[PDB]
Amino acid sequence: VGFALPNPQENLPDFYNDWMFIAKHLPDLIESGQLRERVEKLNMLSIDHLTDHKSQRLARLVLGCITMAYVWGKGHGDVRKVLPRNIAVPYCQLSAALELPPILVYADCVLANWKKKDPNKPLTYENMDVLFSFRDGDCSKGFFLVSLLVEIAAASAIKVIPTVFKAMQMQERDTLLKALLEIASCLEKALQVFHQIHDHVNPKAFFSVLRIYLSGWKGNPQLSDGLVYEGFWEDPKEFAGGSAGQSSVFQCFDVLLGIQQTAGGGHAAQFLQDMRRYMPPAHRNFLCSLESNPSVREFVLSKGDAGLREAYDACVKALVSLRSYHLQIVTKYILIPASQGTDLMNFLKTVRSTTEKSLLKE
Ligand code: HEM
Ligand SMILES: Clc1cccc(-c2c[nH]cn2)c1
Ligand SMILES: Clc1cccc(-c2c[nH]cn2)c1
Ligand SMILES: Clc1cccc(-c2c[nH]cn2)c1
Ligand SMILES: Clc1cccc(-c2c[nH]cn2)c1
């Protein structure tokens, strides 16, 4: 599963039944309007009964989903600017322990938010489920699981990243070449999986229901100063909503290939750098370690080796195809439904253009 939390935990200790009940019933609790009441009446539950990483991750997912639902409600503008103490304090304490900002992140609602139906059959969409959804019909299963499946497909390449760096230091030309071609292959497979967005996510539902609950409170006019995590911090805090930008897997190929997505002070680089603060510390460390290694790009550029250049450009091109396909996705799932905005398209186009500018041959 690469950087997905392998076999996520589904159930918390019974001590947390009141949390788990709210998170399991978000669609009708939000629908009826009883969600904010059930949060406001929660006892303050200590996080000390969360005894292992898996349970903490489940608990962070549970509380993150509750928090998104509490802040946004039905998503029609009646927001809550203060997260009640009895959830904000354990959420922030747990988030501090996991080193993640106390907002729902990609690693919660994708990497930790899934199960196999049949434990004894492969990781296919058909054999999988999400643990939590926000609203009936929000297509959170399709959106989260397809993101997960694209991540798993790409994560197969992570197995090969050590090969790349050791082939470079041991000067193993053929090993470096087959490694780069295998990475390109995984990125190409990831693109095919990517097409399953159309199979399982309806554009209307995503844009008008799901997107609401992934929104954050950074630069957000509805929560202009952030969210007050009551009884934990006195002043409100701004945190970005969930993004696949927060997947180290989806940032690591740019780092690997010396595509400097995070270089400079432009907004695209700043965003992608910022999104690393929402990755699990191990994931963020993986990226930093790649950034410290010798440049694969420079290696390939210095060898006067057309096969090596070809293998490198196959990786770069597969990244370009993913981002071009993704731009089509964004057109269909955001731009079109929004006309029923351009800062967004310019971000993705900037990132794609940085990608294609790294091609060795035009
Ligand atoms: C309904 C389907 C999708 C929509 C509407 C969508 C939308 C967006 C948006 C609005 C952004 C800008 C940054 C942000 O706001 O988070 C973005 C960036 C990004 N998305 Fe998606 N996305 C979708 C599916 C996916 C999937 C399945 C993946 C995983 C392969 C993905 C990977 C990324 C990545 C890695 C970025 C960062 C920019 C980049 O690396 O090119 N997106 N997407
Ligand atoms: Cl609890 C927690 C976990 C991770 C990051 C932060 C944070 C960063 N900046 C302000 N708060 C807070
Ligand atoms: Cl308050 C708090 C708790 C845990 C981690 C951090 C953090 C990470 N980076 C900057 N601050 C902050
Ligand atoms: Cl939180 C979350 C979960 C799955 C995918 C995304 C995403 C895709 N593109 C931008 N964000 C965000
Ligand atoms: Cl599988 C994969 C690996 C790296 C980046 C992307 C991607 C998709 N859309 C924007 N970036 C997808």
Separation CA 246–CA 67 (nearest Å): 19
Q: Which ligand is nearest to the CA of 206?
A: 1
Beta strand 82-83 with 114-116 is unpaired
Residues 169 and 268 in one domain: yes
Residues 125 and 169 in one domain: no
Residues 69 and 181 in one domain: no
Separation CA 92–CA 94 (nearest Å): 5
Separation CA 257–CA 155 (nearest Å): 15
The CB of 96 under 6 Å from ligand 3? The reply is: yes
Residue 102 CA to ligand 1 centre (angstroms): 21
Residues 4 and 14 in one domain: no
Residues 16 and 85 in one domain: yes
Residues 129 and 169 in one domain: no
Choosing from 239, 272, 303, the residue where a domain stops is: 239
Q: Which ligand is nearest to the CA of 189?
A: 5
Separation CA 237–CA 217 (nearest Å): 8
Angle at CA of residue 36, ends 30 and 37, nearest 5°: 115
Separation CA 293–CA 276 (nearest Å): 18
3-state secondary structure 79-120: CCCEECHHHHHHHHHHHHHHCCCCCCCHHHHHHCCEEECCCC
Token output for 294: 């010798």
Residues 169 and 27 in one domain: no
The ligand 4 atom nearest the CA atom of 242: 1
Choosing from 206, 224, 239, the residue where a domain stops is: 239
The CB of 335 under 6 Å from ligand 1? The reply is: no
Residues 202 and 228 in one domain: no
User: Which CB contacts under 8 angstroms, 24+ apart, belong to 232-236?
Assistant: 232/85, 232/88, 232/89, 232/92, 232/93, 233/92, 236/81
Residues 128 and 266 in one domain: no
Angle at CA of residue 44, ends 43 and 49, nearest 5°: 110
From 63, 91, 98, 100, give the residue whose CB has the most ligand 2 atoms within 8 Å, as the site to mutate. 100
Resolution of this entry, Å: 2.1
Helix H or strand E segment including 210: none
Residues 149 and 107 in one domain: no
Residue 167 CA to ligand 1 centre (angstroms): 32
Domain containing 155 equals 1-8+137-214+240-362
Tell me how many domains the chain contains: 2
* DSSP notation for 285-319: HHHHHHHHSPPHHHHHHTTT-HHHHHHHHHHHHHH
Residues 177 and 232 in one domain: no
From 99, 103, 278, give the residue whose CB has the most ligand 3 atoms within 8 Å, as the site to mutate. 99
Residues 118 and 235 in one domain: yes
| Nearest residue to 54 (alpha-carbon basis) of 92, 116, 89, 98 | 98
Exposure string over 68-101, b if 16+ CB within 10 A, otherwise e: bbbbbbebeeebbeebbbbbbbbbbbbbeebebb
Annotated binding site for heme b: 326
C-alpha 62 chain-centroid distance: 16
Query: What is the distance between the terminal CA atoms of the chain, rounded to a whole angstrom?
Result: 34
Query: Torsion angle, CA of 196/142/68/43, rounded to 10 degrees?
Result: -150
Choosing from 180, 205, 239, the residue where a domain stops is: 239
- Whether the CB-CB separation of 101 and 278 falls below 8 Å is answered with yes
Asked how this structure was determined, the answer is X-ray
- Using CA atoms, how far residue 171 sits from 161, 167, 190, in Å, is 15, 5, 29
Q: Which ligand is nearest to the CA of 91?
A: 2
- Give 18's DSSP letter: H
